[PDB]
Assembly symmetry: C3
Amino acid sequence: NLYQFKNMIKCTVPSRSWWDFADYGCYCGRGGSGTPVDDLDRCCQVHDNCYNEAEKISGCWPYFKTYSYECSQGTLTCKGDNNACAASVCDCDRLAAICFAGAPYNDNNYNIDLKARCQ
Amino acid sequence: NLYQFKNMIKCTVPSRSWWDFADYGCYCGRGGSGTPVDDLDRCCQVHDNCYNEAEKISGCWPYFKTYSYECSQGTLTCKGDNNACAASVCDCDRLAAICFAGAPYNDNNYNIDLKARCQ
Amino acid sequence: NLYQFKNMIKCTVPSRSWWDFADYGCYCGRGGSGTPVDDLDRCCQVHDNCYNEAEKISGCWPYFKTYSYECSQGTLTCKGDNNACAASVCDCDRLAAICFAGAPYNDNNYNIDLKARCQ
């Protein structure tokens, strides 16, 4: 679910606040249109597409689905004790947190003019 | 629930991204104040007033309530197998999707200055 | 849960729309960074820090957690029939509603430029 996602980002990017990734570029937080403005914005794009596919599973609502995982000092792991929906969602989240960790964060791409910068 | 509403707009307005209607005018997405800037903004205002009514039912939280419906090729239907809350929310959503479908989408009314344009 | 919080602000600040507090300052709605621009923005900051603490309880997701409370003519009360998570979240919400009620609402701090105004 949304809270567990927030907690994965904390695992991999402890230095940053979850709020920083909530309104970044064209895909982080909101977004589904434009072109990723940068690497991090692309991570968000990819996570978006990932959630899309998980939704193709009946009764799978990504932000509401609680899954089983563990953060062990910068390391994320989704557990086996998850159903199809929980398993797919945890992997999307897990991969987005890792992506956020190796993508540089540009301040100027934070809280941008969607209309002006996103197709 | 929120995911099912997103999927209704997909049913009727396949050509557009659900994110397009997430920050449009004064009422789409956010909003509850101003005067609809256009037809589509009005749809959103009506949906909002519809949700308000649905909340008058004890324990009815519109964005969380999962209902039963079906999209069959541009055609929406709310099923009978819904309790009062589910039934009322599906109706609000189903009507907003159809509204969105016959209301023109103006780019400039996307991601506008709320303060400047909404009372 | 999120709906119940909305209804608490209605109890204490009937005159205002819940949407007014949804994008105010640096912490109302979004936010977790900057410095409260004003009293109300501080309320939101405190609520935020309150939610953080409540999350320290296993399985406690503040916006999803339904609690038991009552608004009795501008008066909020959290009931005893709440588990630890419900009890802690209701308290955060109840205190935010009261805070909102005694904090002045400045129009210009509504829907501001986060980048420009929030560190």
